[PDB]
């Protein structure tokens, strides 16, 4: 197993910025791809981004040019800078972990951390 413990979200308003963080611990194979994604009310769950461990990234297409992926790997640690934050990036974030276990595919979730943006909290 992969834990996953994340960190970082709370209430922001419209343009502002957040960082969230996920911690991993646990059997981390050499080979795996760690994942933010987000679940708001009236919406399926959400890829935001994505890294492999040499960094390559993708993003979703909603949050290109405002969200940014990283690490701290003396942490073991995977971070999501949230920049121009809108009203519907509203959600509950979560880090996720991919990676092979001896009888297939394993996605690993951390618990969440909410994220909400708004103007008239």
Known sequence: ????????????????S??????????????????????????ERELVSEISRVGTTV???????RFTISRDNSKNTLYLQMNSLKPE?????????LQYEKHGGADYWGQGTLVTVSSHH
């Open 59 to 65: 993003y979703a297409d909603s949050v290109k040019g």
């Open 89 to 97: 990036d509203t959600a509950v974030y979560y880090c996720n972990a």
């Open 18 to 43: 957040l960082r969230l963080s996920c911690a991993a611990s646990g059997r981390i194979s050499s080979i795996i791809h760690m994942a933010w994604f987000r679940q708001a009310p009236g919406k």
């Open 1 to 16: 197993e992969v834990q996953l413990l994340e960190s970082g979200g709370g209430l922001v308003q419209p343009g502002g």
